[PDB]
Amino acid sequence: MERVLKVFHYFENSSEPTTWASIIRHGDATDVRGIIQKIVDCHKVKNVACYGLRLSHLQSEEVHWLHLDMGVSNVREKFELAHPPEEWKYELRIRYLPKGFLNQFTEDKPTLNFFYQQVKNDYMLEIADQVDQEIALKLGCLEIRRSYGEMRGNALEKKSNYEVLEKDVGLRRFFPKSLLDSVKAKTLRKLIQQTFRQFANLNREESILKFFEILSPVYRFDKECFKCALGSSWIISVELAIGPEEGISYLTDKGANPTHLADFNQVQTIQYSNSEDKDRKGMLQLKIAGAPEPLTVTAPSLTIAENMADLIDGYCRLVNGATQSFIIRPQ
């Protein structure tokens, strides 16, 4: 008949962020796109095409993006053959960003906060500990400014208000442990108070937007990179960079600008598979208009090739008012 699927998401709902999730039902007809739309609709999302569904094993760092066209039951059965239900986590995420996403998300609050919560969650989990003091202070303060909109600008100056944050709430919800430790609870309070000073005037949207501006130079949430090789005859190892601002590009120097290859709106079709020999590598092929030869990509594994295909498929769907997948599969 039908099954129940728990999907974690980033729509702030007064409670523990880790518990932000939705339970949805699905049948043999239900597909990934269907699940995504159902959830974003209950939150009045306007930029639906920006959302994807990522699945991960709580045990390892391996990630699997579920293709919008695939059936939920089919995919759920496949992975449950590898590991049982409790070791899998399905989370709704924004993956396909429109050209000037922050500016556009401004007109879609539900999605501005969602993107903010997701990116903030990745910040606290991956680089919060090893990031500059000033940054962890600014970013942490901005969140306080945002989470407490109706609070006075100099309210933190009053030791009791701060004490509520240190005792009742927990500064861990805003700053990294490598920050709360490397400083005196007295020096910390003063550092937080004066840092907050500069963001006291900002409103929620301004706080969110300011948060991104500060995080971007030390963390990229506007693109995904993949180490792989290009070519069909003289394979060349490179690092692909895929995002709204550069479409499909490859890295060269460090701080240099990625070199453009193609725009998402030039992609005619996508196809992927296993290496045609004794190899655990995945092949990805893109037919691009205005390009004589197809772009052939050789990724470390089939999983990566599949994860890349979803990224491009999702982008092709976005730049176009497309609802049709651009991936070629055995009919």
Side-chain angles (χ1 to χ4, degrees), residues 1-330:
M1 177 186 67
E2 52 175 35
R3 293 179 71 180
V4 154
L5 181 63
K6 189 176 187 176
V7 188
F8 295 79
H9 60 245
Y10 293 91
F11 291 110
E12 178 166 37
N13 286 298
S14 173
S15 65
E16 181 71 10
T18 71
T19 74
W20 294 349
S22 289
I23 292 174
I24 83 294
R25 282 67 180 171
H26 70 284
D28 288 2
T30 315
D31 66 359
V32 178
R33 185 211 292 96
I35 295 294
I36 289 178
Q37 183 163 301
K38 163 55 180 58
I39 300 171
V40 295
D41 281 354
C42 291
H43 295 274
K44 311 309 156 193
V45 170
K46 300 155 78 299
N47 283 280
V48 183
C50 297
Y51 302 75
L53 187 62
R54 189 186 75 185
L55 169 67
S56 189
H57 188 170
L58 294 170
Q59 221 71 300
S60 63
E61 270 71 64
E62 73 180 72
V63 154
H64 292 81
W65 284 92
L66 312 185
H67 298 188
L68 303 298
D69 55 307
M70 303 203 108
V72 181
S73 299
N74 290 340
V75 63
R76 185 170 184 170
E77 281 179 336
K78 194 185 71 174
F79 287 95
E80 279 172 358
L81 278 168
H83 306 287
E86 42 275 286
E87 302 179 358
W88 288 119
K89 195 184 184 185
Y90 295 74
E91 84 184 69
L92 176 63
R93 293 174 60 88
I94 285 180
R95 196 185 190 194
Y96 329 104
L97 300 174
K99 215 68 175 179
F101 57 91
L102 288 182
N103 194 195
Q104 195 173 307
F105 287 161
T106 289
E107 306 299 309
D108 190 8
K109 259 176 58 70
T111 297
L112 183 57
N113 285 74
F114 186 110
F115 192 51
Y116 170 72
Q117 290 298 341
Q118 166 189 312
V119 176
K120 185 167 57 68
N121 179 64
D122 286 322
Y123 156 75
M124 290 287 267
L125 272 44
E126 292 167 52
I127 58 166
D129 292 306
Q130 66 223 61
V131 70
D132 250 299
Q133 168 205 64
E134 193 183 5
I135 304 299
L137 281 174
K138 288 182 178 179
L139 295 175
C141 282
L142 279 168
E143 170 46 26
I144 289 176
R145 178 64 281 179
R146 183 207 73 76
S147 190
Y148 302 94
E150 255 80 299
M151 179 188 77
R152 276 188 299 105
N154 69 316
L156 292 191
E157 295 293 352
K158 186 165 181 283
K159 189 135 59 63
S160 63
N161 293 316
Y162 182 86
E163 182 177 2
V164 169
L165 295 185
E166 193 176 7
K167 288 177 178 59
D168 310 325
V169 184
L171 302 189
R172 198 65 179 70
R173 295 183 167 165
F174 312 108
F175 313 90
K177 57 184 168 287
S178 68
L179 187 283
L180 295 175
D181 293 353
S182 78
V183 68
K184 322 72 201 171
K186 191 167 183 55
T187 297
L188 181 56
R189 184 223 307 158
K190 297 183 176 300
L191 275 172
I192 284 172
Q193 293 177 305
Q194 60 185 64
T195 297
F196 189 85
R197 194 78 52 67
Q198 64 183 301
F199 307 122
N201 57 311
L202 278 31
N203 58 56
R204 302 191 183 65
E205 195 195 76
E206 304 181 292
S207 296
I208 290 174
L209 296 184
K210 176 59 70 174
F211 182 92
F212 286 110
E213 183 195 306
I214 284 178
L215 182 69
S216 47
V218 63
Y219 187 60
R220 299 301 280 180
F221 44 75
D222 66 345
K223 81 183 68 176
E224 288 191 46
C225 305
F226 308 85
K227 290 176 182 158
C228 53
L230 304 176
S232 54
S233 62
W234 285 101
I235 280 66
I236 302 299
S237 278
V238 306
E239 184 163 29
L240 287 186
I242 305 179
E245 318 297 356
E246 56 282 283
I248 302 169
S249 300
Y250 68 84
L251 285 46
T252 46
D253 311 297
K254 195 204 72 60
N257 307 171
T259 299
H260 173 94
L261 289 169
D263 283 321
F264 297 125
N265 67 56
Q266 289 163 35
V267 174
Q268 299 169 308
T269 61
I270 305 172
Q271 191 174 185
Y272 66 78
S273 61
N274 306 63
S275 69
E276 301 80 10
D277 60 62
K278 307 181 195 62
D279 191 7
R280 65 163 297 172
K281 297 185 183 304
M283 300 293 290
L284 184 71
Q285 191 168 75
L286 305 179
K287 294 227 199 63
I288 303 181
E293 186 187 298
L295 183 59
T296 288
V297 170
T298 302
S301 76
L302 178 75
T303 302
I304 291 169
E306 303 171 311
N307 288 332
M308 289 174 68
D310 175 80
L311 183 59
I312 293 163
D313 179 69
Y315 266 108
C316 288
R317 289 173 184 260
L318 184 72
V319 180
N320 291 295
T323 59
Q324 56 108 309
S325 159
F326 295 65
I327 298 162
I328 299 165
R329 309 186 191 291

